[PDB]
Amino acid sequence: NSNICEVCNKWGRLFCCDTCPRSFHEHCHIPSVEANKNPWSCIFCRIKTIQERCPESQSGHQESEVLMRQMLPEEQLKCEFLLLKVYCDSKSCFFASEPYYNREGSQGPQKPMWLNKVKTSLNEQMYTRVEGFVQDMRLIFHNHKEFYREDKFTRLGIQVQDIFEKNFRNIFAIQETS
Ligand SMILES: [Zn+2]
Ligand SMILES: [Zn+2]
Ligand SMILES: [Zn+2]
C-alpha cells in the first residue's frame, strides 16, 4: 500500500485499502473509514465495482436527467466520491471551512457554503436528489467569484470549479460535447 494519504498526501495514522494500494486518513476518506470490515474496500474500488457490474452505466447521460435522480445508495456514493475528488486538490483548503466576508466594496453572499458543510449534509442524508448536492457545490464557487470580483484571487474559484465539473462529467458519465 501507499505510505501517504491519497487525499491530503501526508503520512500519519492511515487505513489501507484491501483491494487497491491506496491509503487514507480516517476523516479524509468519504465516508469516514468504517470501524470494522476486513477486508475493507475504499471508495475508488466501490465506484469501480459499480462500473464493472454495469458497463453501460458509462454510456453518455444528459445532466438534467442526472440531477433529478433520487439519492439512492449508488448516487449517494457517487456524490461522496465527487466530493472526495475536490478535497484531493490542495486548493480545496480555501473552500473547506466556514468563510467570512469583510472586504471594502463587496458584500458577503446571501447563502454561504463550504465543503465541510456539504460533507456534513451528505453524512446526515440531507440531500434527496443529486441536484441538491450539485447546487451546493456550484454555489461555493459562484459565491467566491461574486465576492472577489476583479481580485486575482477569484481564479482559485475557477480552478477548483473546473476540478469539480470535470469529475462530475466523469463520475456521472455525462455525454461528451464540444
Ligand atoms: Zn489525509
Ligand atoms: Zn481501493
Ligand atoms: Zn447493467
Alpha-carbon distance between the two ends: 39 Å
Rg over CA atoms, rounded to whole Å, is 17 Å
Number of helices: 7
CATH superfamily of the largest domain: Bromodomain-like
The top level CATH class name of the largest domain: Mainly Alpha
CATH architecture of the largest domain: Up-down Bundle
Give the helices and strands as they follow along the chain: EEHHHHHHH
Please state the overall shape, judged from the principal axes of the Cα atoms: globular
Side-by-side strand order of the widest sheet: 1-2
Provide the domain count: 2
Q: CATH topology of the largest domain, anyone?
A: Histone Acetyltransferase, Chain A
Query: What share of the residues does DSSP label as strand, in percent?
Result: under 5%
Bound molecules: zinc ion
Instruction: Give the structural class.
Output: mainly alpha
Oligomeric description of these chains? monomer
Specify the helix fraction band: 40-55%
Largest sheet: 2 strands, antiparallel
User: How many β strands by DSSP?
Assistant: 2
PDB class: transcription
Keywords: PanDDA, SGC - Diamond I04-1 fragment screening, bromodomain, epigenetics, XChemExplorer, transcription
Assembly: monomeric
Entry title: PanDDA analysis group deposition -- Crystal Structure of SP100 after initial refinement with no ligand modelled (structure 71)
